[PDB]
Point group: D2
């Protein structure tokens, strides 16, 4: 079993994954300065469970063990809320994407979905999945959730693409398992993971049956190639000096995972051709994940903190407009938080026994996350001033000629250390333009689906026929009232009482 | 005991309150067409408790009775959440302000505050207050919450006003009780209430001791005058015909309550000179009330439904831009709901036993409420079209010459009854410009305090120093870290891992 | 000739238009308290021309006379700008819709359109139109612009409606002229006008030929019935007392115009069957009218003033948040102003000699008008406080017992007259919820087309192919560059120089 | 005389400016890959003037020469509008900050300000300034506008700082000129300029008289040290390969200018102790420069085009939500343009003869600029998809094994070259997170002052008392009407009926 962050880091050494970064094979990711910040972030998920056991670990009814909360199958609405509390804490502690939420949300969504496949088909995907959960809980591993394919022409489904590999598919089968080819793009923390769960990314039709595959692969499976994603300001991490990085210790990681006839044994296959359940899996995965964006409220707390610090250093902490902007940042940030925890608080039990958060409220959390981080970032930049983008390099600050000039001229209020003022400005740059903006801004935009995806799911659940009848009642319209034909689950949850 | 909405309406008859409306004494408010819709709204709070007992009634540990949820002192976070579920449901059912939330929030806030006054002062305000709760629970009454005074010069406190009566104060005392003078403005449902609880509206200093008065008065108390507030489109109610009203059955009510040496016996006095607790009472009342604005999400549901209906009648229900606007309305509306129910879900036990919702999240609920109704209304008007403001009167629709012309020319898609298209347009007008916009828009703006009041309360709780230290840690700043000196309660609630006393 | 406002009001007396309001024919609109505010607003357009001749009157090349600017066919970009300056002034002076812009914009758009019909068809519409212009310039009359039909099913065109009358059409022809039936809805100031110009409201196909009719009718034409539109708080005008009206002197007017076989002689027909020019007329009318919404910036000025006045009366004029809100109101209001005048400044000469403002910039003006008045309103309500909607009636203020109580208890800061505080609150109510909100809010929303209409026009002129090529150039993309196939007029205006 | 952009590039060679970048003196900025894109942007200001003479060149009444429009003292409202037309075109052509506007706005503002100093004090700053304009017009030079000092404690003015050098000041004088010390921060294109005009940045009181200094210095003046500013993704320029840069040919430049006893001869001094005119100079400089932000609408045009291109490549160009977002971007961008050109169109003649644009409308232009680029960028990222931030490097694309995998898997619709999809994504990254976002976003925010600065200037001109009286009139309030005590100039311009007097 992995126990500490240090144990986790050790577990990543000597694995010989095939990883391309800047046209070179990376022999040891743990030692690569661009990659190590992402690993440190994951390590903190282990360290928090040691320092704050009630927050970051759970009693598993599946294994009868205390497990890391990222590997816990939620047994109550309270367990869902605890995920959110842990996520905000980790965002405060790291200021970045700590990567492990995807696999948590994947596992929780698989628990219920596998149960339902088996109920219809008489298969044993749920039994297979539970044995997997027991293993990863006992060993305390990091699990990637690999849903999003490259997708090719966005207007066409899998079976209509010119190249069938643009969504991940079964290419062959034998007595011992399946072989899959394809790719998964934008994969958070995959190189830092022990196992990756491949999942379909779209509703599938009967024509798309070969793409109805879910399966768990070890990170070091044969036939996998990882091609690392660049980030804004990525190579600052490779430069000597830590100031210009802004957040030197922590960062995120994305890569493209290429699959060439990768083998998955039957015991790790959780869906095989049951195309009509792809949409259920995507729906439930995105239901959880869309309110895991509570994590971004911890980032928000850090960015607010940074804005308040630079205002202090600049000698204008208590001016009205700055105080007002800091309030606005806080308000926006808490609006996201409220939506996410409301979703979790409103969760309900699924047939398999796992709790699922409220889907509608999850869409609201995520939809606001697509908007507000951009505004929080803009207001931070206002408060910081122009030096947030014109500051000289640390190499210049350390220079014998340029350095004293910078120490003199980049003074803020008397008594503030210029190096501290530099460091806080670089943190702001990092979160609004640089490496951690990838997560704070663009992942807020696209993670668990682009804005339009949330709108379509709100549309599905927003009970417009029910609402029409409310309005007709009040307007005294009686003669054209129609029975709603729509999903009616949301108001059943909103108005749930002990009498149903 | 009042059981039904009909019983409630009968309890309002024959009371001879002194009520001025349009320069006339109103002899029987129940029979006045401008007032009756607000009565109907309150009656629905009784009817809902009969139809949906688990939603709208509660088991009181105070009395051991099943009580209307508006009279219940919340015993759990679940109880707070149920207040919100009830609120949204009543909003859906009435499309208006149903008035009784203010008294519920007042009672909940007084339960904890009176306990704490007594703890310090050795008084028996809490005992008095519980006897009051028992009475109103047994009798199933409507309670007004009368906090906001007229206030005069906004830049000055009570003792600095030119006229001391511009905030409500004690003017005399005797062996049996106190006598108060002043006024309470903007008072929701006061004429429709059985009792009204007077409460200070602002932090009080020692110089403001005379204004540190909380007391319950019967609505028919001697020395009270009510001066009714106008509303946008108020007088449509008094015209024959119901179409132009939009929502003819339900509305809200506000009045100015004047107090001239009104007597309050000791048993109904819940604060008497302990000025240092005024800020506690206001804080806690506003904490509850700022997330009672979940009620406005039920009104949002109605408005969304009206916009979808007119789109249907117009022949364009499925056009992209309209669908996208209805999604937006829904998203903004649910954002408010989420904030309010999160506040309630995150509630904590007070010393007296009552649960208080999360103050920070209440601020967020209300602050959003100050913004989003205005946008939902704008979008509704876009979807409706120009006829929302140019539609001819019902008297023209019923006219032998004009009426057939309107039935011909105001057609929507084939098969839609023109009267139904007119009715839905009037509903939209009513909620965005007319009588129900008073509540949906302007009370969203000012109820439980104007926007700036929320911003100041967010500021008080937003833990800037804590957050500065988070940022310093990540930036590698170590040599100027300061211990925060600020309220730290919010993050204690946010990161609370279990429900414990130790 | 009409010269003064008083002359204009006299011109309206004794006409016996058939006007239904509240199920009764109105005997004398000039004396009806609900109608007279709208008449007063139009009278101000005459009085302004006497007080401020350079602003509100123009030298007409067509008649060789000084004419009211509302009747002037623009001869330069300066003439378009002067329209806007006059509009804002009139908004400041009346705080309402003063009605006469529609006819101005109709006439300017007909001047160019008629010329183009004739260029193609060899007809005499432009010559007819110019004789009409000469007459109304000499007589100094008020002209309604009656474009918008009731429209029936919004998803169907004229020839597809279940009732052909739902758009206005020719129903018969004589040796002397045409006969039209139909209706025009939401008609600004029509009962207050001398002449009304009927115009088609949509693109017409060949099947819609019967609906290709433009003609001028006198307001007292046989076969016309007017049905007056309600407004929020309309009947306050009919109550004794002026306080509760907010703006007692001025207001707007809409009515539904019903046409039953109304005769139009040939000399007043400016389009007869040339369906392919309907789109041109609608485009050019809306081009002008979309930036006539500068008028709403004068209303904004009044509402800002009212907000600042109530802050003063409340004793908090200089508090930071109120100052900031006032600034925001000002910024939004000026953004609308700027878009309007930029459109006008960028105008270009048409074949007929009239100048047309920049259509793209007009769209931007209007689109911002659909948004910002709602925000300005919201902020005014914030500043005013709750009394803006809970204030007792004037009848209570004048009562011998209730009145003294109101004088005492509705005090603001010392020295402020309570009646003045009541008055300013009622003005705010009037402009944000009551009669003048119809114009300020809902007419901002729908006048010259609902928001979507402006979006479609921006789309038509936004030169996406040109922009794609800009980006491809800078990205170093060379091998898939396509020639744009789109209207290219906007950037020709943006970059216009003496060299073309 | 410099004619072409090539001539301009050659003029920059061999000057030996002291420039620190990454802890080294830069030997030849023209050949440094981080610096050359900024140079290329300035070169395009010369090339445009050759290609499009009427747009980018002007007939100067000062010299009687045809001059680059960046060196032209505006003689009409039309000349102000032409500045904005040129700005938007340059933004379209470069997608970056092309640097030369700041000098233009500085020179326009100094023209009127020097005249007024002399009118009061009997000095010859205006005559000196005109000789300077003649020189730079004849030689066709690039002029920096160096106003913003580092400023120290933002709550304190110059004479109150702990270190007097935190705002630039005169430290000595002699028979031939003044000597100045201090620094100027965030200086656009300064290393790419021939001359730099130093100007005070704040209202000055009598105690601040030593800081009341305006003067022109050659970029190669003795006692000057430049310290280059970093930019998001700066070092991509220094890597082999051009794809990951997004916009490889063009970028911006900002440096800290350190002044150590720099000599300015009298003929290049345009203010010397007349502290009461600092406010005037700042106001007028910011008046012009706040609507020079029309430049950002040309950048908006590029970003819109990039968003439309990626939608095409992805196979969803005509989906309603994407079309609607494109429309929104266009609307916000045009709103900025309209405010700027309205300001220009509404310009008025100053005492010296130069035209000044409408200050109120400039504030509105700039204030919208502080908001809308951020939304345009957000929408572009929505349309692009996740690859805008997860795309592998060009070195991976060119790798013999990884490259073919990327060519296969990063396909868009059939027929789209994957290299072109990569390139357009990098352009979007460059403009929203990388090197050109410095200008598009953060300079939109702070250039010519932070948002609060615009709010205070709107407040000064918004004629609240006048508006209160409008509302009083309509409400029927007659007995407490007060005469406004405020600047009344804006509505004088709004309601001006003719071009007179
Ligand atoms: S983006 Fe945030 S929610 Fe998603 S995996 Fe990263 S830390 Fe967790
Ligand atoms: S406004 Fe809403 S929350 Fe307030 S009392 Fe009325 S119904 Fe309840
Ligand atoms: S709404 Fe404005 S632009 Fe339209 S007619 Fe009325 S005053 Fe003129
Ligand atoms: S940021 Fe734009 S306006 Fe400013 S100098 Fe650069 S190109 Fe010109
Ligand atoms: Fe995510
Ligand atoms: Fe309220
Ligand atoms: Fe209009
Ligand atoms: Fe700038
Ligand atoms: Na490093
Ligand atoms: Na580094
Ligand atoms: Na009635
Ligand atoms: Na009625
Ligand atoms: Na009247
Ligand atoms: Na009246
Ligand atoms: Na390079
Ligand atoms: Na490069």
């Amino acid at each position: 079993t992995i126990r500490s962050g240090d144990d986790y880091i050790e577990s990543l050494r000597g694995r010989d994954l095939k990883v391309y970064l800047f046209g070179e094979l990376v022999k040891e990711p743990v030692d690569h300065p661009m990659i190590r910040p992402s690993i440190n972030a994951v390590a903190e998920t282990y360290d928090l469970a040691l320092r704050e056991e009630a927050l970051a670990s759970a009693d598993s009814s599946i294994t009868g063990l205390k497990v890391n909360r990222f590997l816990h199958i939620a047994e109550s609405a309270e367990d869902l809320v605890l995920q959110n509390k842990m996520q905000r804490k980790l965002g405060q502690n790291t200021g970045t994407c700590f990567q492990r939420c995807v696999g948590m949300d994947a596992m929780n969504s698989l628990h219920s979905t596998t149960f339902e496949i088996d109920e219809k088909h008489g298969t044993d995907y749920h039994k297979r999945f539970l044995e997997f959960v027991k293993m990863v809980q006992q060993e305390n591993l990091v699990i990637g959730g690999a849903m999003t394919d490259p997708k090719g022409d966005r207007s066409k489904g899998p079976s209509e693409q010119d190249d069938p590999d643009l969504f991940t598919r079964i290419v062959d089968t034998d007595e011992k398992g399946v072989y899959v080819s394809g790719a998964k793009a934008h994969q958070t923390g995959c190189i830092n993971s022990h196992w990756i769960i491949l999942m379909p990314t779209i509703r599938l039709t009967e024509s798309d049956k070969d793409w109805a595959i879910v399966g768990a692969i070890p990170a070091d499976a044969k036939g996998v190639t990882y091609i690392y994603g660049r980030q804004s300001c990525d190579t600052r991490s490779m430069e000597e000096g830590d100031i210009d990085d802004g957040n030197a210790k922590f960062g995120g990681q994305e890569a493209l995972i290429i699959l060439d006839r990768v083998f998955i044994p039957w015991d790790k296959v959780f869906m095989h051709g049951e195309y009509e359940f792809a949409s259920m899996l995507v729906e439930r995965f995105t239901c959880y994940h869309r309110r895991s964006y509570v994590c971004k409220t911890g980032l928000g707390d850090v960015l607010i903190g940074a804005a308040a610090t630079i205002a202090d250093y600049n000698g204008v902490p208590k001016v009205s407009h700055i105080k007002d902007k800091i309030i606005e940042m806080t308000h926006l940030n808490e609006t996201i938080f409220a939506a996410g925890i409301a979703s979790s608080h409103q969760g309900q039990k699924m047939k398999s026994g796992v709790y699922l958060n409220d889907d509608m409220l999850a869409q609201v959390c995520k939809h606001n996350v697509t908007r507000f981080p951009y505004e929080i970032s803009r207001l931070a930049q206002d408060i910081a001033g122009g030096l947030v983008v014109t500051l000289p390099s640390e190499k210049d600050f350390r220079h014998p000629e340029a350095g004293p000039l910078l120490k003199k001229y980049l003074a803020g209020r008397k008594g503030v250390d210029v190096e501290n003022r530099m460091r806080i400005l670089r943190l702001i740059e990092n979160m609004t333009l640089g490496r951690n903006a990838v997560g704070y801004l663009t992942e807020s935009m696209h993670g668990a689906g682009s804005p339009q995806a949330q709108r379509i799911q709100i549309q599905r659940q927003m009970q417009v026929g029910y609402k029409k009848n409310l309005a007709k009642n009040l307007a005294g319209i009686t003669n054209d009232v129609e029975e709603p034909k729509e999903s009616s689950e949301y108001f059943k949850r909103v108005f749930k009482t002990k009498d149903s």
